Structure formats: structure tokens, C-alpha cells
Amino acid sequence: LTGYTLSEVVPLKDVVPEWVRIGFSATTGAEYATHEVLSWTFLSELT
Amino acid sequence: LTGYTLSEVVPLKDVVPEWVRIGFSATTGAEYATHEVLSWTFLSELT
Amino acid sequence: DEITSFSIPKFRPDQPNLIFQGGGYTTKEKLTLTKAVKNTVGRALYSLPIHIWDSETGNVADFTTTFIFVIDAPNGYNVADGFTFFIAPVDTKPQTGGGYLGVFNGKDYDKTAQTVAVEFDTFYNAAWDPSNGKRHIGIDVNTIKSISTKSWNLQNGEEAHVAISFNATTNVLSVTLLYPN
Amino acid sequence: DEITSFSIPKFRPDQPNLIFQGGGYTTKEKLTLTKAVKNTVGRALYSLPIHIWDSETGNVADFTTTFIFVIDAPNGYNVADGFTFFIAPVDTKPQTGGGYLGVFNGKDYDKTAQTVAVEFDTFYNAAWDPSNGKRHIGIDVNTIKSISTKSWNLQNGEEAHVAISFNATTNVLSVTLLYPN
Ligand SMILES: *[C@H]1O[C@H](CO)[C@@H](O)[C@H](O)[C@H]1NC(C)=O
Ligand SMILES: *[C@H]1O[C@H](CO)[C@@H](O)[C@H](O)[C@H]1NC(C)=O
Ligand SMILES: OC[C@H]1O[C@H](O)[C@H](O)[C@@H](O)[C@@H]1O
Numbered sequence: 068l069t070g071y072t073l074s075e076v077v078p079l080k081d082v083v084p085e086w087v088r089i090g091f092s093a094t095t096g097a098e099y100a101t102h103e104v105l106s107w108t109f110l111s112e113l114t
Numbered sequence: 115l116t117g118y119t120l121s122e123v124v125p126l127k128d129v130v131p132e133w134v135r136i137g138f139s140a141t142t143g144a145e146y147a148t149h150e151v152l153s154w155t156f157l158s159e160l161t
Numbered sequence: 162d163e164i165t166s167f168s169i170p171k172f173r174p175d176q177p178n179l180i181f182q183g184g185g186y187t188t189k190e191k192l193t194l195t196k197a198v199k200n201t202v203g204r205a206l207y208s209l210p211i212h213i214w215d216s217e218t219g220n221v222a223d224f225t226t227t228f229i230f231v232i233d234a235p236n237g238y239n240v241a242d243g244f245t246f247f248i249a250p251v252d253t254k255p256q257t258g259g260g261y262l263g264v265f266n267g268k269d270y271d272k273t274a275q276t277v278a279v280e281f282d283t284f285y286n287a288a289w290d291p292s293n294g295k296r297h298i299g300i301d302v303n304t305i306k307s308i309s310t311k312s313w314n315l316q317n318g319e320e321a322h323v324a325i326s327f328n329a330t331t332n333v334l335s336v337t338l339l340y341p342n
Numbered sequence: 343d344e345i346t347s348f349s350i351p352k353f354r355p356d357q358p359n360l361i362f363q364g365g366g367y368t369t370k371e372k373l374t375l376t377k378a379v380k381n382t383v384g385r386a387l388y389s390l391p392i393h394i395w396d397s398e399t400g401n402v403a404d405f406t407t408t409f410i411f412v413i414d415a416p417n418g419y420n421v422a423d424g425f426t427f428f429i430a431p432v433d434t435k436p437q438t439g440g441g442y443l444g445v446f447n448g449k450d451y452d453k454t455a456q457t458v459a460v461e462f463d464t465f466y467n468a469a470w471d472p473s474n475g476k477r478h479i480g481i482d483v484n485t486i487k488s489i490s491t492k493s494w495n496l497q498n499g500e501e502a503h504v505a506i507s508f509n510a511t512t513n514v515l516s517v518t519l520l521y522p523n
């Protein structure tokens with residue numbers, strides 16, 4: 068069990084539009100690899 | 115605290131596609147009236 | 162595939178997550194499907210497709226929806242035609258209006274156009290509605306002729322909680338309606 | 343309280359609730375964005391637009407996503423360019439690619455890129471990647487030069503569950519990747 072974790076404030080209201088999309092974006096270039104995702108959950112709340 | 119209640123057997127699987135859409139309709143003809151929806155939750159579990 | 166839910170406490174002028182069709186537009190707080198105005202249909206559909214059942218496995222989801230709606234008619238006597246929560250194939254359009262509530266076109270079991278609906282019917286269509294001609298709520302499946310109904314006293318201008326659930330293990334669909342009282 | 347969630351345990355070719363872009367597709371189980379092949383771009387988005395803040399009250403949304411993802415490079419020593427989770431305007435489509443991960447263009451702060459991403463970065467770009475040149479997790483906002491960075495050792499072909507979440511009160515993002523070993 069090794070694990071990495073990064074953290075940071077980022078003032079989303081300042082930066083992104085009222086409504087979003089999420090997804091993944093993955094790319095090869097000169098060198099390359101398989102980039103695949105096995106499963107996905109997502110929850111959000113809004114008071 | 116007048117309440118109405120109703121249930122019934124509906125073979126959903128045999129009636130509806132694997133993937134659907136939910137929604138409201140309201141309609142007027144000769145006689146009419148306003149139809150508004152105020153708030154709406156939905157939750158589905160497919161285990 | 163497993164778990165979709167949302168909840169929407171107010172409707173806001175633009176709703177990127179809702180597909181309107183017909184006269185359906187969202188006012189400041191409400192969603193108006195219809196104006197006190199002859200001959201319209203309005204439909205609003207959750208934007209997200211939703212996987213109700215899976216051939217892969219065979220299991221059907223069970224789901225629970227909840228709304229408040231209001232039916233506000235100028236004259237408590239001459240009102241029509243009704244309101245309806247529906248589950249339809251992924252890109253339905255308004256079906257025949259008036260009596261068919263933009264969800265059906267026939268008094269006949271039409272396997273083809275493949276939708277089920279819970280209908281809060283407020284106008285007697287001598288042709289198919291229950292005949293004592295009382296308003297009613299109904300579960301409709303491939304017909305505008307409900308496989309079943311309760312008679313139901315309308316309360317103009319007043320809010321109704323409605324809860325709908327389907328238990329996937331017995332295919333029972335149940336609707337409940339409530340007024341403050 | 344306005345809420346919205348889903349969860350997808352498994353994928354399948356036909357998936358009406360996702361929007362593939364570039365090479366993106368679902369096999370019978372994987373959601374695969376790039377095959378081991380050069381100069382490509384995979385992008386998946388959740389169909390449904392998401393409300394993250396609202397300008398009537400000003401509040402921002404607490405949220406969390408979670409996904410298990412495997413990167414598999416048929417070379418051990420030779421892998422690029424990265425994988426990325428990112429939130430974006432409603433109508434976003436792909437951007438400059440390879441080492442830009444099909445999501446950003448410029449390398450200087452671009453405001454008009456209304457979009458935030460979290461990257462897992464399998465290739466060193468001396469143009470902007472951390473001088474030390476180690477593979478890194480990083481938080482990106484409007485340029486591929488990350489606001490923050492974190493060395494991480496890729497385990498090839500390894501299932502790596504990850505959580506990313508955001509506190510609306512403290513307004514902090516954070517990421518966690520984990521391997522079984
Ligand atoms: C359908 O399933 C339960 C499980 O025991 C059953 O008892 C009841 O009729 C329904 N309840 C659910 C799961 O909503
Ligand atoms: C957000 O969540 C916790 C939950 O209690 C709270 O104590 C605090 O305000 C926030 N903390 C973070 C993750 O910054
Ligand atoms: O609106 C009252 C009635 O008007 C017309 O007769 C329409 O044919 C019918 O659909 C509706 O029920």
C-alpha cells in the first residue's frame with residue numbers, strides 16, 4: 068500500500084462557469100500507452 | 115390531510131428499453147388550466 | 162448502471178439539465194408545463210438517460226421519484242386535461258395532445274411507442290376514462306386507457322406531494338398523492 | 343438541498359450517459375481513452391451538465407468523485423503523456439494534445455480556458471514540467487503548468503483507485519491516489 072496525496076485551494080467560483088462537465092482526458096504523443104478507466108462515482112451537494 | 119394512493123403490477127422490463135428518459139407532460143385542449151411542477155427528486159438503484 | 166439520483170428544489174430560468182419540449186419553459190422558481198391557454202402540450206425531460214434495466218444481467222432497477230406539482234385553473238369547473246410523469250424511450254417527442262397528455266395517441270395497447278405514465282387526469286374523456294366521470298389518477302402503459310385508477314378530488318391552486326416508487330423485486334409501481342390537510 | 347450523484351461500476355459499448363470525444367470508447371468493461379498508439383486524445387464526459395456554484399446565493403458545491411484507473415505501457419521505460427480528470431464548461435471539446443493532454447493549449451495562464459484539471463503525468467516536459475523531471479500528480483488551472491505538483495512512481499498495469507474532492511467552505515481541492523502495494 069503506497070499512496071500519494073496532493074492538496075490546494077482553488078477558488079472554483081472565481082474560475083469555472085455556473086454549469087460544468089466532468090470527464091477524463093488522456094493523451095499519447097511521441098511516446099504512448101493504454102489509458103483506461105475501470106469505474107466511476109461522483110456525488111455533489113449544493114446549499 | 116387528504117391522501118390518495120395506488121399501486122399495480124407493471125412489467126417494466128417487458129415494456130421499456132434498457133435506457134429511458136423520465137419526465138413530465140401536461141396538456142390542454144378546449145378546457146385548459148395551468149400546470150406547474152415545483153420541485154423534483156429522483157433516485158434509482160440498479161444492483 | 163447502479164445509482165443515479167438528483168434533487169431539484171427550485172427551477173431556475175436556464176436549466177441545462179432539462180430538455181424542454183412544447184410550451185414547457187422554466188419560470189423564476191417553478192417549471193411551467195402549461196399556461197391557462199387552450200390547446201398546448203409541454204414536456205420536460207431529465208437530460209441524463211437512465212439505465213432502468215440491464216440485459217447484461219437481467220435485473221431491473223427500482224426507483225423513487227418525488228415532486229410537487231400545482232394545477233391552477235381559472236375556473237374550478239372547466240379544467241383539462243391533465244399532468245403526468247412518464248418514462249419513455251430515450252428520445253420521445255410530444256405525442257397527441259389533449260386527452261392523450263402528449264404521451265399517447267391511442268385508446269389501444271400499442272406495444273410500439275413504449276412508455277408508461279402516471280397520470281393525474283382532470284378531464285373526462287367519455288371514450289376511455291373511468292365512467293362515473295370523476296377525476297382520477299392512473300397508471301398508463303402503452304395506452305391512454307389506464308390499467309388502473311383511483312378517483313381523485315382535485316384541489317385547484319394547491320400543492321400536492323406525490324411519491325412514486327417501483328419495487329424492482331415484484332414489479333409493483335405505486336403512486337401516492339398528498340394535500341396539506 | 344440540491345444534490346446530484348451517480349456511480350458506474352462497469353462500462354459497456356453502448357453508454358448513453360457519456361460523451362466520447364477523440365479516440366474515447368467503452369469496450370465490454372473498460373472505458374478506454376487511448377490504445378498503446380501515438381499522437382492520440384481520449385475524452386469522456388458525463389452527459390449531464392453539473393451545477394457547481396450558483397449566482398443567486400453565491401454558494402459553491404461540495405463534491406467528490408472516485409475512479410479506478412489503470413495505465414498500461416507496453417514499454418516500461420517508454421510511456422506518455424498522461425491521464426486527466428477535469429471539470430470544464432458545458433460545451434467543451436478537446437484541446438491541443440499529447441503532452442497537453444487534450445485539455446489545455448497554452449502554457450501561460452489562460453483565463454478563457456474556463457477549465458480546471460487534475461493530472462497524472464507520465465512524461466517530462468522541460469518546457470514546463472517540474473525541473474526534477476519525475477512523474478507527477480498535479481493540480482492544473484488554465485495552463486498545463488500546474489499550480490501544485492507531486493512526484494509519484496507509476497506502477498504500470500496497476501489498478502489505482504483515486505479520490506478527488508473539494509471543500510466548499512475551505513475551498514480546498516485535494517487528491518489521493520493509492521495502490522494495493
Ligand atoms: C421490494 O424489496 C423488498 C426487500 O425485502 C421487499 O420486502 C419490498 O416489497 C420492496 N422494498 C424495496 C427494496 O424497495
Ligand atoms: C470541509 O469538511 C469538513 C467536514 O466536517 C469540515 O470540518 C471543514 O469545514 C472542511 N474541511 C476541509 C476538507 O477543508
Ligand atoms: O380539453 C378538453 C377536450 O378538448 C377536445 O375535445 C380534445 O379533443 C380533448 O383531447 C380534450 O379532452
Ligand SMILES: OC[C@H]1O[C@H](O)[C@H](O)[C@@H](O)[C@@H]1O
Pocket residue numbers: 095096097098099422423439440441442465466467
Ligand atoms: O509524449 C512525449 C511528447 O510527445 C510529443 O512529442 C508531444 O509533442 C509532446 O507534447 C509530448 O510531451
Ligand SMILES: [Ca+2]
Pocket residue numbers: 242243260282283284285286290
Ligand atoms: Ca382524461
Ligand SMILES: [Ca+2]
Pocket residue numbers: 423424441463464465466467471
Ligand atoms: Ca507531461
Ligand SMILES: [Mn+2]
Pocket residue numbers: 280282289290291297299305307
Ligand atoms: Mn384518465
Ligand SMILES: [Mn+2]
Pocket residue numbers: 461463471472478480486488
Ligand atoms: Mn506535468
